[PDB]
Swiss-Prot record:
It is an enzyme of class 3 (hydrolase). The keyword Zinc-finger does not apply. It comes from the Eukaryota. Monomer. InterPro entries: Glyco_hydro_22 (IPR001916), Glyco_hydro_22_CS (IPR019799), Glyco_hydro_22_lys (IPR000974), Lysozyme-like_dom_sf (IPR023346). Lysozymes have primarily a bacteriolytic function; those in tissues and body fluids are associated with the monocyte-macrophage system and enhance the activity of immunoagents. It is found in: Secreted. This is Lysozyme C.
Amino acid sequence: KVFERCELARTLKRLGMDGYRGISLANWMCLAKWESGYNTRATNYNAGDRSTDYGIFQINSRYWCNDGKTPGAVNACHLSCSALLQDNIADAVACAKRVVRDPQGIRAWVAWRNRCQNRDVRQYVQGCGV
């Protein structure tokens, strides 16, 4: 599914993302916007390293989920990468939380550094009731 902006904001809030390990909801929203355009079915094959990015947060198969086809990969979220292509984003959120428990936090995603870090991200949650 492709979420609408404010629907996603409330969905993320109910899933415990607001302020998770210091990360505001607007930062999560900016991440999802730039990774996938709020699209849970999004995928991107990385031909350079044989890994794939899955779902609304474009989480990568080398470290975080198992797809069986990424050489030498691990599965730190302990999920099939299929779980990151559901309309229901609970598993994707659990995995995103796992990612940010590691030292880099939200900086794990280069798109966040490029498109969200040191930016005014208030617009992503305006009007959404969060």
